């Protein structure tokens, strides 16, 4: 059966974390 | 050690005639870094773009040449 | 039993059907027939066109080997006469001038004395004049 | 100006060159201001962490979008008819015609059609519901997060690695061979055995019940006793229907060989024994180099021992050269990756692994073209970074008399003989092609010079192809090699001796001509790259080229003119030849496979011997469906491909402005424009901050080459996809 | 700005000085050549790197070399 | 040229009514049309001693030799 | 435009942000950064 | 004439003469014996 | 003067090749059924296929320079 919209929203919430980690890594590499 | 009428091989390693043979045109008194003058048959690349020839002579020191004659 | 996918054009129905209409390249009216009779002896594909075999076998030696030697002799002739003329013109006090204005007598003299080029080249190599030492040649910086 | 902080020469530039060259030299850490070796290595380590995280995010996004907007759970029920869906389309600029045209694959909205063949890959490894795809996407998100955090952490001052830790070659080789290769392949074999094969035999195995059900009815007893042959007993029958239990065996590790009768792909049990054996071999290989226990080989001793009497010093001091230079390592890695990428393409288009992927012709064509182009790019990069090594890292006194420094001793011979071979190939290949063209033009095509590719046909015979009647080796049923009772021989000979597959396609004269043309292209691109790399240190025209760096415009018009003299210019020239060779390669592959799929092999067999056949039966003929994607009468699903086709034909041409016209003209024009702006009332209020200037010479070459390459890739991609999809899809 | 260096192979032929359009070179007394003069580049901040000086040099390779570096308003030859 | 690119994109997207075509937003060369109309009327009054127009490209009858058109009006 | 996939409203807002809001913001910040004088 | 002979012996005239000679050789051999794919 | 001589040689060449190697007299009878032709190819290696049929039993290259119409307009 197809995905549920709650799954999509949860996927976005989960993907929030690698965004923050990537921002931190980029700022560290900028130094 | 050389004089006019000597066939020499070049060892400058940056000259155009490295490994070529040239004739000793003239040498002069001391106090000059590169006294010997060598004239070559094959001209080098010198000249502006589209020029018809180059330069057939240069100045070398004594230890940059090997004597053949 | 090589070339099980190839059959002689003499026994190829495609070649038999398509060889009746061969065009005439020259004004000679039989040149199509001559082409057909000469190409009947080759190996043909399913399209009725001759194919050549260059694996080295002597049964198909005319496919590549004979024209190979035919080319090689002429190319060696040209190269040897050119090199000989250049070498002999070098010590003429104006080799550069005689490269644009051809010395016709000497040019023809080298043209004639050039059929024996293989023997001359073999003799010269044994005499050391065919190649030069690497310490006697201009080199670019490493 | 602050930007770029890593270079002060660029930071004081008042023009717009500052921004361009700041972007250009950003990721070249080796020449930043005040850069140390340790800091360089640590920055590289963190950036590599970043690229890995990006790769994992990309894979997660592919999985997520397929699971969300795809038709996987309907594609599995009929892989031979349904079209896989890549992602949905949300274009507000769309009209109604495009909306009706792109509502394809039995969807309910505008939608794309996947040609990366991920549906086959997911089906083959046992994923049957989109919930599993979603779980994989989330897990990949978590993995990417972990790798980003790892980069951040190993960048911290107290977790910052030392220089010696970055120069431990033996330990890195051991760990990455045994662990990264051997252990990973062993785990993959375990995944195939424990999950993939049972799912292929109609058994649902997941995390909830994999720990209970054993893959084989006799679990781990024969493996330790030594009765391994039990696992190879009762394999899948030829009447096996993929994904069901109808006519399926219980064996897990077999050497059946050949192809699955239904999916026309390699047997999964063959994959299992293959990856397991490879894992064992790699684990044995990983215990080769000594780290700290005394046992093991040391690379320096090996290299210094293998000296030659003809090479003077042999492989002396090469360990220090390779360990100290990063460009040497990058060149070696790029060469290896390009070679094995080309290998991947060649051995995948002929030996498909994923189920039903041979039937879907468009995806096969796309995969071959994609990985072959990538291999070409990597091969160019190997030589480019090797030339950079020669410019920067090479030491003529540490490498004295070894093999590396001995190349420069006979570099003139290398370049001259390579140029001779390129000329010899090109002259006679073009002569044969033009001869055939002229002969056919005069209405007498029976006079074509048609050479049979005898040697390659002999190779096919040796592998066991009986069509040509050479009866040598495996084709000879009486030779020793064909009577060893090897378990793979019957199935393999069955697969090779059927024309229904791409396994060892039948070849003819046009194949001979095009292979020799490809050889010409390869030797010529190699000539350009090798000449550029060997002349990087210097030449007669510029004996001191090393003191000028790697990428400099020229040396002015003096000494006869010195345009395009740096090694960067050799790379820039060789890129064109790489593109041309890849074009020839892919055109040949595509035409031959179009003939094979349609069954009309005669078309290629006839018209591939002269160039007009290529122009008419391949270019002119197949373009009919593509360019009619949108018409004065309407529009169909190939409209986007026609638009991208024209887009590539436009960008390719746009690159010629930078490739042909040069700087001074544009600088004078820009001066006039500056005058015009400064004298315009109501426009002098707004003034620039960086003085506008024309693009630099090297930047111009790079930009032109970039536009050229993008157009070149996009045009052929659009043509290939559109032609194959309209004809078959 | 660009860097102009004169090596010890100069013969004091003065061609480089005359060929320079932005007045960067100069003739200074010397002893290593017959002409007893050598080339100097006191005003390299005004050099645009047009390579005319090198094109005028008659010695083998070049006794005068020009290496292009940081670009300023002068070295880029801008009038705006 | 952006007129051409815009027309291309509008056709590609299934928006033929947004194109720059004669059945859409029109760009009529009314000046050349007017000059053609004038040059067609020249034999009437503006050049009284002329029998036919200088060329049938401007307008008028269709001149055909054998079965092939020799010259006909070019709209 | 609309589709039958779950959470069909997500493209309606996500695509404009990644097409207008995100590019505008990043180019604005980059232009501000690349022009900040001093501190070379 | 000396100058006439010297002009006739210049590079372009001589290469044109040799090229036309070889072209004549090939043309005649192909008129009398056409369609020679190989030596049987 | 030299370029004038060259142009005159070219013009005389066109006139001669139309006089001798053309079907101008043939075309002059039925100009709506005979294609102009003034280049004839020697049959050597199969280029005799180029001497195509231009009508009226003449075989040669069809010309497009319009010399036949110019000559007829010259009487
Ligand atoms: C791998 C490439 C290769 C090469 C280099 C050769 C080379 C050769 N093959 Mg050959 N061959 C090959 C593949 C190859 N073969 C394959 C794949 C097959 C199987 C289809 C054959 C089948 C084959 C046959 C059946 C014969 C050859 C023969 C020959 C030789 C011809 C003598 C000659 O011209 O020299 C002389 C040159 C001058 C005098 C100048 C020559 C050494 C012939 C032979 O026996 O010669 C030794 C011969 O009869 N070949
Ligand atoms: C006016 C023309 C026009 C425009 C504006 C669009 C716009 C769009 N189309 Mg589209 N389309 C058009 C014509 C057009 N189309 C035509 C004529 C056809 C043929 C019928 C199509 C066929 C088509 C299909 C089939 C699809 C689209 C899709 C899309 C959307 C993709 C969103 C996107 O790419 O964001 C992301 C933006 C980019 C990837 C642009 C990046 C480009 C640069 C070069 C890369 C960045 C380089 C550099 C590093 C940048 C630095 C940082 C930067 C921020 C400064 C977007 C709304 C897709 C869609 O609906 O999306 C779900 C889709 O599937 N279109
Ligand atoms: C067992 C321990 C172990 C393991 C697992 C790794 C693993 C890794 N190390 Mg490593 N390392 C180790 C010990 C280990 N290291 C030790 C002890 C040292 C110190 C001596 C180092 C020092 C070190 C350095 C200095 C660096 C690494 C890096 C890396 C990463 C390379 C990135 C990559 O391509 O991987 C993925 C590779 C594979 C999955 C295999 C390669 C694929 C080959 C070509 C075969 C192709 C497979 C198949 C045919 C295709 C599949 C198709 C499928 C998709 C359908 C990788 C994750 C690099 C990095 O930055 O990572 C963060 C790096 O710069 N390591
Ligand atoms: C390399 C990855 C890998 C991993 C993690 C597993 C993991 C597992 N396998 Mg498996 N397996 C693998 C590869 C792998 N397998 C391969 C390549 C084969 C060859 C076909 C098998 C064949 C196999 C069979 C036939 C069975 C398992 C079973 C099992 C389960 C428990 C038994 C076990 O492994 O204890 C290992 C215990 C030991 C004492 C091994 C010695 C110590 C090691 C070296 C550490 C467990 C989930 C059993 C199962 O499903 O549980 C009922 C079972 O019956 N596996
Ligand atoms: C593992 C891969 C890898 C790595 C780590 C490096 C690392 C490096 N390379 Mg190398 N290289 C590689 C592969 C790699 N290379 C390959 C495959 C090639 C062949 C093409 C090259 C060719 C190459 C050259 C020719 C040069 C380097 C240089 C460098 C150094 C950094 C400068 C640089 O390129 O950054 C800056 C990079 C860029 C500015 C690239 C931007 C171009 C973008 C990505 C293209 C996008 C096109 C367009 C937007 C697409 C939109 C499509 C849309 C319209 C539809 C650094 C040592 C330089 C050097 O000498 O360093 C000392 C240098 O001159 N490399
Ligand atoms: C169709 C276009 C084309 C062609 C034919 C060539 C041909 C050649 N390139 Mg080349 N090149 C091209 C485009 C082309 N290039 C482009 C676009 C680039 C990107 C800038 C390059 C970049 C490039 C580099 C960087 C190098 C070459 C090299 C070569 C030579 C390698 C030998 C070879 O491949 O075949 C053999 C040669 C040919 C097939 C060409 C000869 C064709 C004629 C018909 C032969 C007879 C001459 C003819 C009768 C003369 C009549 C003149 C008269 C009518 C006035 C060859 C001369 C390499 C080289 O110099 O090799 C030593 C080399 O280093 N090229
Ligand atoms: C078998 C006998 C034979 C016959 C009947 C002809 C007949 C002809 N040849 Mg000829 N030819 C022959 C043998 C023959 N050739 C041989 C063996 C050669 C090789 C040397 C040539 C080389 C040759 C050339 C190079 C040319 C002719 C030309 C001609 C035509 C002009 C008349 C002529 O010969 O003067 C002209 C003769 C020459 C210019 C060279 C003759 C050299 C002799 C044969 C030695 C005429 C149709 C000319 C032609 O058709 O004009 C376009 C022309 O250009 N022929
Ligand atoms: C469809 C038409 C195809 C032609 C398109 C036209 C292309 C543009 C023309 C080029 C610019 C013209 C002036 C050249 C520019 C110019 O004058 O020289 C420029 C260039 C040399 O320029 P440099 O600045 O290097 O020269 C400085 C030296 O002159 C020092 O004095 O010379 C050539 O290009 C050499 C060409 C000679 C050609 C060698 C072959 C001779 C063949 C002659 C046969 C000719 C045809 C015969 C009649 C059919
Ligand atoms: C598939 C492509 C076929 C053509 C590829 C290249 C054509 C020419 C290749 C010849 C290599 C150059 C001459 C050999 C270079 C050379 O003579 O090196 C000398 C070398 C002898 O090696 P030694 O035993 O002295 O030591 C070799 C090592 O111990 C250290 O290098 O001879 C060979 O190894 C020949 C095989 C090279 C392969
Ligand atoms: C003598 C001479 C010169 C000089 C020549 C020199 C110096 C030559 C030097 C050559 C060297 C150093 C090396 C040569 C190597 C040659 C090799 C390796 C030949 C290989 C042959 C093979 C592999 C034959 C292959 C098959 C043989 C057979 C006929 C089959 O059916 C077809 C086929 C193709 C399979 C010039 C250039 C100055 C001038 C010339 O005119 C003459
Ligand atoms: C300059 C330089 C560089 C570069 C270069 C390059 C990159 C190269 C490449 C190269 C290459 C890339 C090569 C390749 C090679 C390959 C090979 C060598 C192969 C082999 C193979 C074989 C031998 C096979 C065999 C077989 C067969 C055939 C069949 C059966 C099986 C077997 C396997 C047996 C570098 C960086 C390094 C360094 C520095 C310098």
Task: Please report, for residues D6, D554, E77, F26, the alpha-carbon distance to residue D20 in angstroms, rounded to integers and kept in the order given.
Answer: 14, 19, 19, 43
Give residue D364 CA to ligand 2 midpoint distance, Å.
26
For chain H, the residue count is 40
**C-alpha angle G6-G7-G12 in degrees, rounded to nearest 5:** 130
Pairwise CA distance, residues D11 & D27, whole Å: 16
Residue D359: closest CA among D62, D82, D112, D586? D82
Contact with chain E for residue D16, Cβ under 8 A: no
End-to-end CA distance of chain C: 55
Which residues 1-40 of H are in CB contact (within 8 Å) with C?
A: 6, 9-11, 14, 30-31, 34-35, 37-40
- Chain C, window 22-81: residues with a beta carbon less than 8 angstroms from a chain I beta carbon: 23-27
Taking CA–CA distances from D629, the nearest residue in chain F reads: F12
Q: Using alpha carbons, select from D328, D316, D534, D340 the residue that is nearest to residue D419.
A: D534
Q: Are D720 and D369 in contact (CB under 8 A)?
A: yes
Cα distances (angstroms) measured from residue E5 to each of D561, D612, E41: 21, 59, 7
CA–CA distance from D359 to each of D125, D154, D256, D266, D729 (Å)?
18, 47, 22, 14, 10
Angle at D282 between CA D280 and CA D283, to 5 degrees: 65
Whether D52 is in the pocket of ligand 3, judged by its Cβ within 6 Å, is yes
Q: Which of B8, B17, B19, B20 best probes binding to C when mutated, by most C CB atoms within 10 angstroms?
A: B19
Tokens 């994609």, located at residue: D370
Rounded CA gap, D619 and D613, in Å? 9
D612 is in an annotated binding site: no
Strands F68-71 and E37-40, how do they pair?
unpaired
For residues I17 and I64, the answer to whether their CB atoms sit within 8 Å is no
CA distances from B39 to B58, D648, H34 (A): 7, 57, 58
Q: Distance (Å, rounded) from C-alpha D599 to C-alpha D506? A: 13
Q: Measured from the CA of D534, which atom of ligand 11 is nearest?
A: 1
Show residues of chain D in contact with H37, CB under 8 Å. Answer: 447, 449
* CB proximity list for C42: less than 8 A, separation 6 or greater: C8, C9, C50, C51, C52, H37, H38
Atom from ligand 5 closest to the CA of residue D333: 1
**With left for phi above 0 and alpha for psi between -120 and 50, is residue B34 left, alpha or beta?**
beta
CB atoms within 10 A of CB D252: 21
Q: Is D308 in the pocket of ligand 9 (CB under 6 A)?
A: yes
Closest CA to B57 of B19, B29, B16: B16
Judge if the upstream peptide bond of residue D199 is cis by omega within 30 degrees of 0: no
Contact G6 A2 (CB under 8 A): yes
D583 lines ligand 6 (CB under 6 A): no
Pick from D613, D612, D616: nearest CA to D624: D616
In chain C, the number of structural domains is 1
D554 known member of a binding site:
yes
SS (H, E, C) D308-354: CCCCCCCCCCHHHHHHHCHHHHHHHHHHHHHHHHHHHHHHHHCCCCC
Partner A contacted by D87 (CB < 8 A): no
Q: Whole-angstrom Cα distance, residue H36 to residue C31?
A: 11
Find the CB nearest A21 among D43, D67, D145: D145
CA D46 to CA D38: how far, in whole Å?
A: 13
Select the residue of E54, E68, E71 nearest D558 (Cβ to Cβ): E54
Contacts with C21 from chain D: Cβ below 8 Å: none
Using CA atoms, how far apart are residues B32 and E32, in angstroms rounded to an integer?
5
Question: How far, rounded to the nearest angstrom, does the alpha carbon of residue C98 sit from its chain's CA centroid?
Answer: 29
Find out whether D576 and D712 touch, Cβ atoms under 8 Å: no
* C contacts of D462 (beta carbons < 8 Å): none
CA dist D511 → D427, D500, D506 (Å): 18, 19, 9
Q: Collapsing DSSP states into helix, strand and coil, what is residue F65?
A: strand
D2 → closest Cβ in G6, G11, G40: G40
Give, in order, the Cα–Cα distances in Å from D478 to each of B61, D43, D347, D475, E75: 77, 62, 29, 9, 81
Cα(D360) to centroid(ligand 2), Å? 27
With a 6 Å cutoff on the Cβ, whether D423 touches ligand 6 is: yes
C90 touches chain H (CB under 8 A): no
Question: Is residue C142 packed enough to be buried (19+ CB in 10 Å), middle (13-18) or exposed (0-12)?
Answer: middle
Q: What is the DSSP string of G3-40?
A: -SSSSTHHHHHHHHIIIIIHHHHHHHHHHHHHH--S--
Q: Return the structure tokens found at D29.
A: 């850490």
User: Is F66 in contact with I32 (CB distance < 8 Å)?
Assistant: yes
* Spatial separation of the C-alpha atoms in residues D551 and D595, rounded to whole Å: 46
F71 membership: H or E segment, kind and range: strand F68-71
I and G in touch (3+ CB pairs within 8 angstroms)? no
H/E segment holding residue I68: helix I67-73
* Two tokens, residue E74: 């002068």
Q: What is the CATH number of the domain that holds H8?
A: 1.20.5.510
**Cβ(C45)–Cβ(C6) under 8 Å?**
yes
For C83, phi then psi, to 5°, come to -65, -40
**Residue D61: is it exposed, middle or buried by C-beta count within 10 angstroms (0-12/13-18/19+)?**
middle
Which domains does chain D show, CATH number per domain? 1-728 (1.20.1130.10)
**Does the beta-carbon distance from G7 to A8 stay under 8 Å?**
yes
Tell me the residue range of the domain where H13 lies. Answer: 1-40
- Among candidate residues C138, C142, C134, the one with its CA nearest the CA of residue D408: C142
- Give which of F26, I34, E65, A31 is closest to D156, Cα–Cα: A31
Residue D620, exposed/middle/buried by CB under 10 A (0-12, 13-18, 19+)? exposed
- Cβ distance B59 to E59 under 8 Å? yes
Contact predicate E49/E4, CB 8 Å: no
- The CA distance from C72 to the nearest CA of chain B, in Å, is 33
Q: Positive or negative, the Cα torsion across D172, D178, D184, D185? A: positive
Contact C/D (≥3 CB pairs under 8 Å): yes
CA distances from D130 to C28, D76, D89, D480 (A): 76, 11, 20, 51
Ligand nearest to the CA of D232: 4
* C38 touches H at CB < 8 Å: yes
**What tokens appear for E5 in the block?**
């260096």
Q: D545: Cβ–Cβ under 8 A, 6 or more apart, which residues? A: D535, D536, D537, D538, D539, D565, D566, D567
* D218 touches D230 (CB < 8 A): yes
Nearest Cα neighbor of I31 from D184, F68, C137, C90 is: F68
> Which two tokens mark C106?
């000497």
Q: What's the CA dihedral at A18, A22, A24, A25 to 10 degrees?
A: 130
Neighbour count for residue D213 (Cβ, 10 Å): 12
Matching residue, tokens 């899948």: D236
Q: F10-39 burial by CB neighbour count: b if 16+ within 10 A, else e? A: bbbbbbbebbeeeeeeeeeeeeeeeebeeb
Which residue from H minimizes the CA distance to D444? H35
Cβ of D426 closer than 6 Å to ligand 6, yes or no, is yes
Helix (H) or strand (E) holding F64: strand F63-65
Are E65 and E49 contacting, i.e. CB atoms less than 8 angstroms apart? Answer: no
* H/E stretch holding I28: helix I24-29
Q: Does A12 touch chain D (CB under 8 A)?
A: no
Residue D533 CA, closest ligand 11 atom number: 1
Centre a 10 Å sphere on the Cβ of residue B62 and count the other Cβ atoms it contains: 11
Decide if D142 touches A, using CB distance below 8 A.
Answer: yes
DSSP B58: E
What's the angle, vertex CA I9, arms to CA I6 and CA I11, rounded to 5?
Answer: 110
DSSP for chain E, written as a single string: --EEEE-TT-----HHHHH-SS---EEEE-SSSTT-EEEE-TTGGG-----HHHHH--SSS-SEEEE-----TTTTT---
**Token pair of D682, please?**
């109501």
What CATH number has the domain bearing residue C28? 1.10.8.110
D199 Cβ contact partners less than 8 Å away, ≥ 6 residues apart:
D126, D128, D205, D243
Q: B47 is written with which tokens?
A: 């000249």
Backbone CA torsion sign across H23, H26, H28, H30: negative
Quote the ligand 11 centre to D335 CA distance (angstroms).
Answer: 8
**Of D459, D440, D462, residue with least CA distance to D449:** D440
User: Where are the strands (E) in B11-64, listed by range?
Assistant: 21-26, 36-39, 57-60
Residue D657, annotated ligand binder? yes
Q: Burial-class residue H39 by CB neighbours within 10 Å (0-12, 13-18, 19+).
A: exposed
CA of D123 to the centre of ligand 2 (A): 30
For residue D523, which of D585, D578, D455 has the smallest C-alpha distance? Answer: D578
- Contact state of E60 with B28 under an 8 Å Cβ cutoff: no
Scanning chain F, the segments in alpha helix (DSSP H) are: 2-12, 30-41
Q: Is B66 helix (H, G, I), strand (E, B) or coil?
A: strand
D509-534 vs D361-392: helix axis angle to the nearest 10?
20
First to last CA, chain G: 48
- Print burial letters for D315-334: b (CB count within 10 Å at least 16), e (below 16): bbbbbebbbebbbbebbeeb
Distance (Å) from CA B6 to ligand 4 centroid: 86
Closest C-alpha among D312, D374, D383 to residue D340 = D374
Radius of gyration of chain F (CA): 18
Tell me, in angstroms, the distance from the centre of ligand 8 to residue A23's CA.
Answer: 60
Ligand closest to Cα of D535 equals 11
CB contact under 8 A, D602 and C47: yes
Total count of residues recorded for chain D: 729
By what technique were these coordinates determined? Answer: cryo-EM
Pairing of strands C7-8, C43-44: antiparallel
Structural domain tally of chain H?
1
Show the domain range for C102: 2-142
Between CA D410 and CA D276 the distance in angstroms is 45
Answer yes or no: is the C-beta of D175 below 6 A from any ligand 3 atom. Answer: yes
- Tell me D630's DSSP state: B
CA distance, residue E15 to nearest chain D CA (Å): 14
Residue D515, annotated as binding a ligand: no
CA distance C53 to D509: 11
- What one-character-per-residue DSSP string does D31-93 give? GSTT--HHHHHHHHHHHHHHHHHHHHHHHHHHHHHHHHH--HHHHTT-TTTSPP---B---TT
Longest dimension (CA), chain G: 54
- Torsion, CA A10, CA A14, CA A20, CA A23, rounded to 10: -100
- Those of residues 33-52 in B touching chain D at CB distance below 8 A are 45-51
Residue of B nearest to E33 (CA): B32
User: What token pair was written down for C94?
Assistant: 């104006």
- Closest among F2, F21, F20 to D650, alpha carbons compared: F2
């Amino acid at each position: 059966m197809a995905l549920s919209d709650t799954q999509i929203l949860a996927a976005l919430v989960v993907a929030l974390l690698p965004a923050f980690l990537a921002f931190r890594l980029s700022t560290e590499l900028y130094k | 050690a050389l004089n006019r009428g000597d066939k020499v091989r070049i060892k400058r390693t940056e000259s155009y005639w490295y490994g070529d043979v040239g004739t000793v045109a003239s040498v002069e008194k001391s106090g000059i870094l590169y006294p010997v003058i060598v004239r070559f048959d094959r001209v080098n690349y010198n000249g502006f773009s589209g020029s018809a020839s180059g330069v057939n002579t240069n100045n070398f020191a004594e230890n940059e040449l090997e004597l053949v004659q | 039993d090589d070339f099980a996918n190839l059959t002689p054009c003499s026994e190829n129905p495609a070649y038999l059907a398509k060889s009746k209409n061969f065009l005439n390249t020259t004004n000679d009216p039989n040149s199509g027939k001559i082409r057909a009779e000469r190409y009947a002896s080759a190996l043909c594909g399913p399209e009725g066109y001759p194919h050549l075999i260059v694996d080295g076998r002597f049964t198909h030696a005319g496919d590549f080997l004979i024209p190979s030697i035919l080319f090689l002799y002429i190319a060696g002739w040209i190269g040897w006469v050119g090199r000989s003329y250049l070498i002999e013109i070098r010590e003429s006090k104006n080799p550069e001038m005689q490269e644009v204005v051809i010395n016709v007598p000497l040019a023809i003299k080298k043209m004639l004395g050039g059929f024996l080029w293989p023997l001359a080249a073999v003799g010269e190599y044994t005499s050391g004049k065919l190649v030069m030492k690497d310490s006697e040649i201009p080199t670019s910086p490493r | 100006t602050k930007f770029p902080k890593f270079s002060q020469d660029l930071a004081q530039d008042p023009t717009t060159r500052r921004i361009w060259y700041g972007i250009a030299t950003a990721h070249d850490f080796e020449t930043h201001d005040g850069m140390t070796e340790e800091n360089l290595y640590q920055k590289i380590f963190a950036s590599h962490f970043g690229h890995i995280a990006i790769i994992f995010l990309w894979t997660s996004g592919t999985l997520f979008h397929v699971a969300w907007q795809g038709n996987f759970e309907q594609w599995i029920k009929d892989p031979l008819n349904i079209r896989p869906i890549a992602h949905a389309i949300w274009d507000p600029h769309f009209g109604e015609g495009a909306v009706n045209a792109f509502t394809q694959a039995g969807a309910s909205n505008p939608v794309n059609i996947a040609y990366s063949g991920v549906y086959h890959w997911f089906y083959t490894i046992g994923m049957t519901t989109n919930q599993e795809l979603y779980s994989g996407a989330v897990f990949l998100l978590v993995l990417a997060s972990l790798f980003l955090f790892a980069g951040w952490l190993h960048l911290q001052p107290k977790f910052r690695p030392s220089l010696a830790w970055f120069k431990n070659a033996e330990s890195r080789l051991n760990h990455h061979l045994a662990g990264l290769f051997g252990v990973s392949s062993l785990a993959w074999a375990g995944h195939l055995v424990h999950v993939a094969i049972p799912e292929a035999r109609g058994q649902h195995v997941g995390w909830d019940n994999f720990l209970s059900t054993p893959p084989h009815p006799a679990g781990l007893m024969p493996f330790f006793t030594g009765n391994w042959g039990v696992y190879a007993a009762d394999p899948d029958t030829a009447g096996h229907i993929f994904g069901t239990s109808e006519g399926a065996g219980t064996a897990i590790l077999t050497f059946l060989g050949g192809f699955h009768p239904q999916t026309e792909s390699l047997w999964l049990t063959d994959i299992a024994h293959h990856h397991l054996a490879i894992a064992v071999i790699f684990i044995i290989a990983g215990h080769m180099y000594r780290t700290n226990w005394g046992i093991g080989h040391s690379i320096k001793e090996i290299l210094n021992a293998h000296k030659g009497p003809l090479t003077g010093a042999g492989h002396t001091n090469l360990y220090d050269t390779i360990n100290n230079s990063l460009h040497f390592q990058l060149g070696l890695a790029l060469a290896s990756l390009g070679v094995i990428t080309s290998l991947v393409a060649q051995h995948m288009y002929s030996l498909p692994s994923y189920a039903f992927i041979a039937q879907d012709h468009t995806t096969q064509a796309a995969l071959y073209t994609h990985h072959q182009y990538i291999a070409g790019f990597l091969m160019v990069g190997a030589f480019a970074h090797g030339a950079i090594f020669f410019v920067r890292d090479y030491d003529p006194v540490a490498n004295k008399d070894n093999v590396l420094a001995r190349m420069l001793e006979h570099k003139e011979a290398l370049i001259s003989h390579l140029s001779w071979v390129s000329l010899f190939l090109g002259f006679h290949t073009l002569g044969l092609y033009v001869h055939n063209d002229v002969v056919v033009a005069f209405g007498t095509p029976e006079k074509q010079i048609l050479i049979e590719p005898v040697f390659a046909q002999w190779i096919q015979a040796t592998s066991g192809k009986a069509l040509y009647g050479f009866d040598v080796l495996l084709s000879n049923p009486d030779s020793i090699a064909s009577t060893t009772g090897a378990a793979w021989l019957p199935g393999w000979l069955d697969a090779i001796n059927s024309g229904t597959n791409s396994l060892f396609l039948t070849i003819g004269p046009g194949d001979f001509l095009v292979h020799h043309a490809i050889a010409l292209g390869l030797h010529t691109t190699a000539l350009i790259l090798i000449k550029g790399a060997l002349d990087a240190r210097g030449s007669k025209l510029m004996p001191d080229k090393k003191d000028f760096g790697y990428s400099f415009p020229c040396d002015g018009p003096g000494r006869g003119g010195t345009c395009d003299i740096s090694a960067w210019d050799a790379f820039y020239l060789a890129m064109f030849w790489m593109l041309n060779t890849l074009g020839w390669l892919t055109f040949y592959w595509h035409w031959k496979h179009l003939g094979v799929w349609s069954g009309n092999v005669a078309q290629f067999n006839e018209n591939s011997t002269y160039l007009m056949g290529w122009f008419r039966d391949y270019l002119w003929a197949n373009s009919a469906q593509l360019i009619n994607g949108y018409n004065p009468y309407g529009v169909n699903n190939l409209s986007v491909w026609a638009w991208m086709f024209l887009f590539g034909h436009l960008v390719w041409a746009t690159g010629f402005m930078f490739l042909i016209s040069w700087r001074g003209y544009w600088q004078e024009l820009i001066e006039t424009i500056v005058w015009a702006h400064e004298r315009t009332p109501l426009a002098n209020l707004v003034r620039w901050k960086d003085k506008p200037v024309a693009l630099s010479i090297v930047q111009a070459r790079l930009v032109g080459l970039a536009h050229f390459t993008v157009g070149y890739v996009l045009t052929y991609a659009a043509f290939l996809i559109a032609s194959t999809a309209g004809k078959f899809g | 700005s660009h860097s102009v260096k004169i090596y010890d192979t100069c013969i004091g032929c003065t061609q480089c000085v005359r060929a320079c359009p932005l007045d960067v070179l100069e003739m200074v007394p010397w002893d290593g050549c017959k002409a007893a003069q050598i080339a100097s580049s006191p005003r390299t901040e005004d050099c645009v790197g047009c390579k005319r000086c090198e094109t005028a040099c008659p010695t083998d390779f070049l006794s005068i070399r020009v290496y292009l570096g940081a670009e300023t308003t002068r070295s880029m030859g801008l009038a705006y | 040229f952006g007129l051409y690119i815009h027309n291309d994109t509008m056709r590609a997207l299934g928006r033929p009514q947004d194109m720059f075509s004669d059945t859409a937003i029109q760009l009529q060369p009314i000046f050349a049309q007017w000059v053609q109309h004038l040059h067609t009327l020249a034999p009437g009054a503006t050049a009284p001693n002329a029998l036919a127009t200088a060329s049938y490209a401007f307008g008028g009858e269709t001149i055909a030799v054998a079965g092939k058109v020799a010259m006909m009006p070019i709209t | 435009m609309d589709g039958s996939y779950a959470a069909s409203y997500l493209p309606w807002i996500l695509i404009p942000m990644v097409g207008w809001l995100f590019p505008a913001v990043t180019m604005g910040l980059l232009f501000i950064h690349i022009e900040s004088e001093g501190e070379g | 004439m000396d100058g006439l002979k010297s002009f006739l012996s210049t590079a372009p005239v001589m290469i044109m003469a040799l090229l036309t000679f070889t072209a004549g050789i090939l043309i005649e051999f192909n008129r009398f014996y056409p369609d020679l794919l190989f030596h049987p | 003067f030299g370029h004038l001589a060259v142009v005159f040689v070219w013009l005389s060449g066109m006139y001669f090749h139309g006089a001798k190697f053309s079907n101008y007299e043939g075309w002059l009878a039925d100009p709506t059924h005979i294609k102009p032709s003034a280049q004839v190819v020697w049959p050597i290696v199969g280029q005799g296929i180029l001497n195509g049929d231009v009508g009226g039993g003449f075989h040669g290259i069809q010309i497009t320079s319009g010399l036949f119409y110019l000559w007829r307009a010259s009487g």
